[PDB]
Enzyme design. Sequence first.
Site, PDB file in Angstrom:
ATOM      1  CE  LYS A 171      -4.449  -1.231   2.179  1.00  0.00           C
ATOM      2  NZ  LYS A 171      -5.222  -0.688   1.052  1.00  0.00           N
ATOM      3  NE  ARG A 226      -8.182   3.851   0.379  1.00  0.00           N
ATOM      4  CZ  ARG A 226      -8.675   2.845   1.093  1.00  0.00           C
ATOM      5  NH1 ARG A 226      -9.849   2.311   0.762  1.00  0.00           N
ATOM      6  NH2 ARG A 226      -8.019   2.403   2.167  1.00  0.00           N
ATOM      7  CB  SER A 238      -8.539  -4.192  -1.153  1.00  0.00           C
ATOM      8  OG  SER A 238      -9.406  -4.409  -0.060  1.00  0.00           O
ATOM      9  N   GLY A 239      -6.881  -4.041   1.774  1.00  0.00           N
ATOM     10  CA  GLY A 239      -6.594  -4.759   3.002  1.00  0.00           C
ATOM     11  C   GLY A 239      -7.657  -5.836   3.217  1.00  0.00           C
ATOM     12  CG  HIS A 240     -12.099  -5.115   3.905  1.00  0.00           C
ATOM     13  ND1 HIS A 240     -11.718  -3.888   4.432  1.00  0.00           N
ATOM     14  CD2 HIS A 240     -13.186  -5.512   4.618  1.00  0.00           C
ATOM     15  CE1 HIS A 240     -12.539  -3.565   5.419  1.00  0.00           C
ATOM     16  NE2 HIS A 240     -13.438  -4.531   5.551  1.00  0.00           N
ATOM     17  NE  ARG A 261     -13.263  -2.198   1.961  1.00  0.00           N
ATOM     18  CZ  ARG A 261     -13.625  -1.477   3.023  1.00  0.00           C
ATOM     19  NH1 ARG A 261     -14.821  -1.674   3.603  1.00  0.00           N
ATOM     20  NH2 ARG A 261     -12.766  -0.626   3.573  1.00  0.00           N
ATOM     21  CG  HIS A 267     -10.389  -0.916  -1.944  1.00  0.00           C
ATOM     22  ND1 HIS A 267      -9.070  -0.546  -1.904  1.00  0.00           N
ATOM     23  CD2 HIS A 267     -10.755  -1.182  -0.661  1.00  0.00           C
ATOM     24  CE1 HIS A 267      -8.640  -0.541  -0.655  1.00  0.00           C
ATOM     25  NE2 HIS A 267      -9.659  -0.927   0.130  1.00  0.00           N
TER      26      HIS A 267
END
Length: 576
Positions: free
Chosen positions: A351, A358, A400-402, A488, A494
Site C-alpha cells: 500500500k 483512493r 485492498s486490506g479487506h 469494497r 477500492h
Amino acid sequence: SVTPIPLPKIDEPEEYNTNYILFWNHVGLELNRVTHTVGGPLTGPPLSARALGMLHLAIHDAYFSICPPTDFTTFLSPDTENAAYRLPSPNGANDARQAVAGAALKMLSSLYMKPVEQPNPNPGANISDNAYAQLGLVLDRSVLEAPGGVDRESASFMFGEDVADVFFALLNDPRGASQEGYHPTPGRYKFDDEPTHPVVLIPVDPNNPNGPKMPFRQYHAPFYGKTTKRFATQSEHFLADPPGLRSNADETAEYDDAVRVAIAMGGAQALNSTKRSPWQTAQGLYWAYDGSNLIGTPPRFYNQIVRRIAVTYKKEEDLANSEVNNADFARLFALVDVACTDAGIFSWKEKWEFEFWRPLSGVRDDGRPDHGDPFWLTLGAPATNTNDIPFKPPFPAYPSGHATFGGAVFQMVRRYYNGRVGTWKDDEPDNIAIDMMISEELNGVNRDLRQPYDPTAPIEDQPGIVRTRIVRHFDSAWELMFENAISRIFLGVHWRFDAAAARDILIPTTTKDVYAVDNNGATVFQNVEDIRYTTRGTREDEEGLFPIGGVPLGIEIADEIFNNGLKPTPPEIQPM
C-alpha cells in the site's frame, strides 16, 4: 469506579464459549471492539490483526507443549539456541486449560495495558486513562467468566505466562503505527488526504476531551510493512504494478474502465449515476468493520466467521470437555490469525510503496471533462454507531486490506479442511458452507446515530437509523473470499484491481480491458464457481509475473505458511 460501556449482544450460540480456546479468542475480540470505541492501543487493521496473531501463537505453544501434537510441532522450540526463539519448558505443568488461560491473560495484559514501562514515547501514545481503564474492566471481567476458572497460583498458569513473555518480547511492535516523518506527495495516482475528511480536530489532551482541539492529518502505519518483523512467511511478497503506474502506466484502457465501474458501482445511494442494486448495497456494508464504535476492524469479523466454521465442522460434539476439539481449535486459530497478521503486513507494505490514490480522489481529480466527476461522492466506509458521515480509510488503495486479509484467512481455512469437509483442488472452489451468519453492520441493532454516541448507554437507547437485520448463508470459503473482496467496490473505496485482476472477476467484452454491463449499466461479475485467480502482471523493479490485487496476494501468503507447517520467518530475512 469507571462506568462500564454497555456492549451489544453478539449473534452467536452461547455454547461456543464453554470451550476455553474459543473463550480466549472471544476475549481478544472484545478488546478489539472496545479499543476501537475508546481509542486505545492496537487500533487499525494491520495492528489489530497482529494482536490476534500474537494471542493465538501464545495459546498454540502453551497448549501443544502440554499436549504434544503428532504431525506439526510447536511454533517455537525448547531446545533452540537462540534465546529469543526459546520456548520455556513445562517441567511438571500438566494442566492445559490453566496454561492457555495464563498465556492468554499475559499476552492480552501486555498488549492492552498502561505502558508504565517508560518506553511510552509516542509509539502510538495519545490514549486517555479512561481508554486503559475500560479495557482493564474487560480483562478483569474475563478472569471471572473463563470456563473452569483461572488459578493464578497454578504451575500450568505460570508456565503459560512464561510462554506469553517470550512471544511478546519477540513480536511486539510498539511503534508500528508511527506516522512520524511521512507526508503525501501529490500528483496523478497519488494518495493524499481524502476531500470529505481533509483534517480532523482531535483534543490536545485526550484526558480532557471537551477542551482544546488541534488539526490532525492521519496516515495509517506508513512504515509498518517495510520495517516490522514477519511472523511465518518464508519469503517477501510482491504485487504487479497497478494500472497507470510504472511498468503498467500504459494500461490506460484498464484504468479508464476502472474509473467508469467505480462511478457506477460505488457512488452515493441517491446519485443519478449510481447503478448498484439494494442487494449489492447490502454486500458492501456486510463486510465493512471499518474500525467503528462497538464493532472494531475486519480481523474481528473474519474471526467471528471462522468460529462458526470451527464449531460447525468439529469432530466431537462436546465443546466443553474434548481435547480433540481443543487441539483442532488451538491449531486452526493459530494458522488463521498468523496468516491474517502477515497479510496485514504485506498489504500495508505494498500500500505505501505504490501510494495509489483512493477512487474518490481519482474520480474528482481525474481532470478529463468526459471521464471524471469533480463532485462525486462514494457510498463510503460506514461510521457505524456515530453521527459522523461515511469516510475513506486513511491509507493508500492498492491492494485492498479487506481482500488480502480475506484471501489469507479463507485460503487457510480451505487448506485446513480439504479432505475433511469435502475434496477440492487447492485452487478451485471448496465445499465449506455456513449459514445463519450475521454481520454486526447489518444486525437490526447497530445504527447511524442522529447525535454523538453516548458510551454510558446501550445503543438501543440511542436514536438513529437502525441497520436492517440480514441473515446470510454462504456455500463455500471461495464465495466468502470473493464477496468480502468485491464489497469494497460497492462501497466505492477500492478500484476493481485492488481486489483482483479485472479479467478474473468481470465478464469480458470484445473490447479489451472493457467489461460487461447490464441493462441499467451495472457491472456484471463472473460466477463464483468459475472464478480462477490466474491473471499475473509485471513490476518495474523485478523480473517475472506477479499477482494483481489483494485476494491473490492473500492466497499466496496462506499457502506458503501452511506448506511450511507454521514455522517462524527465518531471522536472516527479517527487515534491517
